[PDB]
Amino acid sequence: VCMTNWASLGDEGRGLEVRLPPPTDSSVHAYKTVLSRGYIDNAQFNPLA
Amino acid sequence: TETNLIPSHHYGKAFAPLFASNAMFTRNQRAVITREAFVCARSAVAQCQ
């Protein structure tokens, strides 16, 4: 799975991360950043966007 | 426009409560009565004069 900075030491961090959960879980929370606030409930991705 | 609109989904839901209200079929029923009350009244002032 794609987990950024899972192994980093001696620094504060950049500020943002992308951390997909493994495919047994949902992994929809990283594909709802634009055109997906109050239009589509927190269970689906938006395939038109 | 809105945030994420589709002109097919949005026009379909907005025109859906207008095609259920039978005002298209209330026009035709009032039309033939207005025709049928016309000839029975045009020939009601033409047989008097």
Give the Cα separation of A45 and B16 in Å (integer). 27
The Cα–Cα gap between B47 and A16 comes to 91
Phi, psi of A19 (to 5 degrees): -140, 95
Inspect the interface and report whether the beta carbons of A35 and B6 lie closer than 8 Å.
no
User: What is the nearest CA distance from B18 to chain A, expressed in angstroms?
Assistant: 24
Q: Name every chain A residue with its beta carbon within 8 A of the beta carbon of B6.
A: 48
The structure tokens 């839901």 sit at B13
Contact B2, A37 (CB under 8 A): no
Answer for the pair A48, B4: CB distance below 8 angstroms, yes or no. yes
Residue A3: helix, strand or coil by DSSP? strand
> What span, in angstroms and rounded, lies between the C-alpha atoms of A18 and A26?
14
Quick one: closest CA in B to A49, which residue? B4
CB contact under 8 A, A39 and B6: no
The method recorded for this entry reads: cryo-EM
Resolution in A: 3.8
CA distances from A49 to A2, A16, A23, A40 (A): 21, 22, 21, 11
* Residues B9-34 as b or e (16 or more Cβ within 10 Å = b): eeeeeeeeeeeeeeeeeeeeeeeeee
Residue B10 C-alpha, separation from nearest chain A C-alpha, in angstroms: 13
Residue linked to tokens 């997909």 = A20
CA–CA separation, A3 vs A45, rounded Å?
A: 20
Give me the DSSP letters along A9-38.
-SS---S---BPPPTTS---TTS-SSS-SS
